Design a protein around this ligand. Sequence first.
Ligand SMILES: Nc1ncnc2c1ncn2[C@@H]1O[C@@H]2COP(=O)(O)O[C@H]2[C@H]1O
Ligand SMILES: Nc1ncnc2c1ncn2[C@@H]1O[C@@H]2COP(=O)(O)O[C@H]2[C@H]1O
Ligand SMILES: Nc1ncnc2c1ncn2[C@@H]1O[C@@H]2COP(=O)(O)O[C@H]2[C@H]1O
Ligand SMILES: Nc1ncnc2c1ncn2[C@@H]1O[C@@H]2COP(=O)(O)O[C@H]2[C@H]1O
Lengths: 389, 389, 389, 389
Amino acid sequence: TYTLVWKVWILAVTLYYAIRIPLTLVFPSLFSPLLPLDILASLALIADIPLDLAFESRLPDLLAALPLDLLVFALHLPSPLSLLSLVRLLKLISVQRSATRILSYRINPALLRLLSLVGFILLAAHGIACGWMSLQPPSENPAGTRYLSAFYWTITTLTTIGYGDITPSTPTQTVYTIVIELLGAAMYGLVIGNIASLVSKLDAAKLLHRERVERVTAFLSYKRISPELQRRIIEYFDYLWETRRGYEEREVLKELPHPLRLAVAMEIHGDVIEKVPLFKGAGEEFIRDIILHLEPVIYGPGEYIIRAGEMGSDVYFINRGSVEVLSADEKTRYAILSEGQFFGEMALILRAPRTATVRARAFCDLYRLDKETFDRILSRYPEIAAQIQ
Amino acid sequence: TYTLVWKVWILAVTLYYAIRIPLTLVFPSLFSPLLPLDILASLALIADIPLDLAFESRLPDLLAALPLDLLVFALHLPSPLSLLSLVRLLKLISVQRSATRILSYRINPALLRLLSLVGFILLAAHGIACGWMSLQPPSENPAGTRYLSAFYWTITTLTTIGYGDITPSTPTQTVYTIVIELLGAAMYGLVIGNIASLVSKLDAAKLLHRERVERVTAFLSYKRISPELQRRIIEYFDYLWETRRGYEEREVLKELPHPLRLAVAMEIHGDVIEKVPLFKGAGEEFIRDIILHLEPVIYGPGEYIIRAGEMGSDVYFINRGSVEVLSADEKTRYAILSEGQFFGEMALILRAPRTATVRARAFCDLYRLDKETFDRILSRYPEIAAQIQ
Amino acid sequence: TYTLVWKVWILAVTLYYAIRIPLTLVFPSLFSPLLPLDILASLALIADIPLDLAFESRLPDLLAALPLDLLVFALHLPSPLSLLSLVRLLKLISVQRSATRILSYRINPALLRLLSLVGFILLAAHGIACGWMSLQPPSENPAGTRYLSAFYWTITTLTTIGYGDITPSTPTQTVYTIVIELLGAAMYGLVIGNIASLVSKLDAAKLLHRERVERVTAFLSYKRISPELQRRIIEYFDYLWETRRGYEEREVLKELPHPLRLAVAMEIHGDVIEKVPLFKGAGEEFIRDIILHLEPVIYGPGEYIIRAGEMGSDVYFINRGSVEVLSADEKTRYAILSEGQFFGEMALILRAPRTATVRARAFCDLYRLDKETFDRILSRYPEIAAQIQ
Amino acid sequence: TYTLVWKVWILAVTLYYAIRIPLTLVFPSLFSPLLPLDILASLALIADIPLDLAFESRLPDLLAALPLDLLVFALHLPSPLSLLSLVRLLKLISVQRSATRILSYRINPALLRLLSLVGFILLAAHGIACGWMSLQPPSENPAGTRYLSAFYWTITTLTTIGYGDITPSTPTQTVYTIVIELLGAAMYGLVIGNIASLVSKLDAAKLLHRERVERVTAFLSYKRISPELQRRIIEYFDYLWETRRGYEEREVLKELPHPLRLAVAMEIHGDVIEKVPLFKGAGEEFIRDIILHLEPVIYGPGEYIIRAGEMGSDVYFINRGSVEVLSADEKTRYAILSEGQFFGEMALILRAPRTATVRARAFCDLYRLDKETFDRILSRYPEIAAQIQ
Ligand SMILES: Nc1ncnc2c1ncn2[C@@H]1O[C@@H]2COP(=O)(O)O[C@H]2[C@H]1O
Ligand SMILES: Nc1ncnc2c1ncn2[C@@H]1O[C@@H]2COP(=O)(O)O[C@H]2[C@H]1O
Ligand SMILES: Nc1ncnc2c1ncn2[C@@H]1O[C@@H]2COP(=O)(O)O[C@H]2[C@H]1O
Ligand SMILES: Nc1ncnc2c1ncn2[C@@H]1O[C@@H]2COP(=O)(O)O[C@H]2[C@H]1O
């Protein structure tokens, strides 16, 4: 758990190198003031190059391990022989790999890639400003002012803005500006593509539900469906989006493995069947088997779950909604059933027409178990089929 | 239902603050002329900060509740001590959250996010123009003209255009222009990504049908399918796209819950089975059970639904098309069947070869019920199996 | 079929209006030279406004029907009272709707939307150049040269390039340039989004096959699969992509309706079962029923379809590949089977171990029919079960 | 295998032509110095135009075959009559087609299209620089310097940067700059769209797993699932992503054909059933049949695979994890089972309650075979049902 601070320190030291080595390349009078920090960074990299193998393609790390920057700056080598100090930025590839490895589970990978690209773009802009120094004619200008001008020019170039108040004056400056132009176009396209990918998946669930509703309502309007049924279906879809975020229970449950799905079924509806008087005198295997076959169904307000006098082969367990039960002819209210309650128990023990109708008060979700699955389950458990009969 | 006008008023007051507080920061001679509106806005925010809890992360609302802007403007504090008045824009986050909460169901969420980003970009452009005032050297220029120049510069920057006729002249102006450059690149990328996400889902159904047709025709061309069958399949796909928008009936129906699917089946084909002479003397449960197993099939023009003399185990209910019936050898036209009619009733009561052939005149859609599902349904209802036999 | 030329003429006349009315607004000395074309266009629009109801939201058409442009130009009304002539561009909305309606089936809808946006952008650029005339100070410059300058400026603005050699000089010019800046950013974002949507679906099948291969090979590498089996699976996937474009036969077939799927099965494998000696003395219903249950399987080179001495319950019909049959111990080659041939016929008439092994020479695709479906089919046709026994 | 070097040579020769013919159009004093290379390229194209038919829409190849460039340059034809030499770039279309044909399987097609577009954009930029020469006024400037200026201008235009330090001065230059402006906007939009398409599919598997986890956890949080079960499910999903990259075994296996799936089952679990004492004295057909019905299930740490005293109808084969077995009441550890081992063998030979419980130590993956599939398999093989009983 203590490797996170070490990785953060590696981030800090590699950013310090990325900001320092091109500035020191530009200004030779910068090696000595930051010499202690430079040697500290070098020894940190040396001590980190074996530490990567502990608690874990490695060519960039090896290239950025040995200190080329110290030799070229101490010897005051010319620019072609000092451009080899730029190998310290090979640490950035391994840093980005480690960052994607450590915090991918906590941060959206598209957003993480976008922030990594933004940081790399800022570092590249600093490097391009330093390169702009390398070709700008010498002048009696403060280092801060000329760095501000170079950073302004490179930020104008990368963002494809092109004010034109800072333009090349020498052929080498023109070649460098063409290269930076192409690089800035490439990274601006990368930024826009990353933003587009992030945005297109920002509301994936909402868009999925929207197209789900649109296709259903278009199909219904083709089939000449009355506005009442259309409004009821739209209200059901709105309730589904507001409660389950438009996710069907069956699709989510089947995507889980057998033991996790069994535990989920336990926690969702084990109490509601534990209240059930019929299923006592039975082992936990029978309970798990019957609740693994509970098919959820959502009933809107004013909908008839069943009709009295009809055959009936289903048993319903209320999960989160509230539902009312009326008489056979639906004049008087027998009782009120809420979460944790169940009805239709008479259908399991006897094959006779139902006694009373039950209608949903509001949007209620309940689990329906047909007689086929119940008979299949009790067939595997003859000892349970005795007392129920 | 009266909270919509209150939310609209909150929108208006927060936009007024967003347009006012930076302008008043720029021009000190603006606090007094808009003092009544300022105090009205302040009292509206104070009265709204408890109203959010009624009829419903809250840190921005609390930050934007108390009036920092009134204190700094009355005391004429310097710019570093008056930048704290910008906390009133924390109301914008809650405003955007409320806007996404209230009208997401009525407006495409991608388009809603795009418009919200456009409005925020306009407000940010106004703020950036005000900041451009804050660093522009003082001059004897009208407020309108200098605001027009600043807004022109910031709109040029944000849209990544960069005319260059308005460029920084001071180092602080250069730093501010770099910051605004990065911000404008970021928001232009955001705009382009939002537009790309909106466009990619503009014709999701049409693109789905297009790739559906393309894969089918490529597979058929691989299998050496004659141009006649290819043209017939293409015509069927065109009819499907023009009627059902390329949506299969089974996929749409199975995506609905059991009661809503039952009601949809009711409205689609309850009349066509109510005409059916065979199914009278039966309860509504049997009707719902049989029509819940009706598998829709689309028959193109000139296609043979069945052949006379063949065994036959299907019954078809015309839904929206028109179909013709010929003789066994197909010389004479027996009759014409249209929407609401049905044929194949003889197969349900007797297992004998069919008497006559039936061929589709135009593109007709009808529901086919095989003998297996019918026998399964009537087995559950022995009382219905009596009169049918 | 003669409405296509009329729609093309409407396209030409509305483009002529879009290019003419702003130019004539800019140059008052342009109404008379194009007066015959103007009145011809007006009468064409008048005669077309009832023709839309024949052989087929209509508010833009009604607005663009009556000739506001003729009145304002003849009366030489000022700019605020002549801006009402721009209602003729309301014809563009109906033109775009008709274009999307007529040729959506022949041209990729994303590409069609991109071209429509490009044309609208060109027309808008012409209009913006005309507006640039409307605010440019009067000068002794040729109309062609000033139009070229205005079009250059507007094309620079819309493409977010911003050279800056043409910049506003008056406050009204600055406001117009800000508006055109925002519009150009919006339409450039629209162009980029349309291009991104078009590109993301350019290789949908290829990308689907690529991710299909990648997930399979990653899962196999996780399960420690030898390089031989990995190479065989990669070769099979390459063959599948090169022949069927990565589309599984079952997925394509099940996406078709029952009669079209039956006809496809007819054309694919009716000859190969017509050669089959066992299935003669049988009606076409039995043939269609058995071939509707043919499950396709792809066998790579060197793969064992079955093994001699094993029980065996499958019959295979070669479709497009070439396959060889060896002895029971696989020393001698019994024969060579090609497209249109079949083997495994002994398993249908007798439940005994197979006599010889059969191995694929090259990548061969054949249809496998297990004994379960065959027994189910022949059970429905007892008259066919006689001679086969 | 020797056609790859020929295709590379064609690439080199067509790039040489693309860089040469516009430069020679600009500078008439360039035909003679590169005459041997020109005639070598011409003869290479002539010898390649029949070679395309060997070891394989052809109109561009025929157009670019015959040497129009040699005639116009030798005759020193004017620009309108020498623009016909640009037909040599028709070779680029066939080159791109061949490149997409040869290395699509080895390189991501989106990335390949992006690189092809980048190369075409560089060639077009060179051509646009040459066209900029064609309209630039003659001056005593070195060819290198003026080419650098033209390339700088065209790169500024295409990347939508627009510095403005190089602007048109003549009407023809203005028209050319407008055309290049539109072309640069189009290709920049193409680059951004290609980058967006590449990025959106960079982490398709990771994004799929992320949305899989998000929908599951949202559904569970809706159903009031305790943080313990939520954490267990999150840990299982993390393990699944880290091992199988979030791919379910069933989905991957069913996407393979029957023989390849059979071979995969062989290699995955043939040894673990070869250790099994019960299944000896059985043929390979029975082994393949039983292992083709092995349903994989993933059990997290601390999870109960079965419970002692319960009926039990499953047999589990450990594949990659490690699992422990305890007593019936779970006080003592019976043994330790690892990869290649199996338990639950008693359920196959006798229908009695299980003797001991088995719980997973760490995340273990094992294949569960229920009694239904085993009974179905052994029913087809009566000779195997003897010794097992
Ligand atoms: N007053 C009530 N309280 C609780 N449950 C009831 C009441 N009336 C009817 N039910 C249930 O509703 C069912 C409808 O008919 P059943 O025969 O299935 O058995 C009935 C009971 O399970
Ligand atoms: N003239 C007709 N009018 C209506 N239906 C018919 C006519 N002729 C045949 N049919 C139907 O077409 C069916 C074809 O053969 P069946 O034996 O299934 O029973 C037949 C009737 O259901
Ligand atoms: N020489 C051959 N020519 C054609 N088919 C053959 C030949 N030898 C074997 N077969 C087929 O291969 C099958 C393998 O064993 P069966 O008993 O299924 O019946 C066999 C025949 O159908
Ligand atoms: N000590 C052990 N070593 C290996 N396997 C065991 C051990 N104890 C129990 N099992 C297995 O675990 C199973 C649990 O109950 P069964 O009756 O299915 O048969 C048991 C054996 O297959």
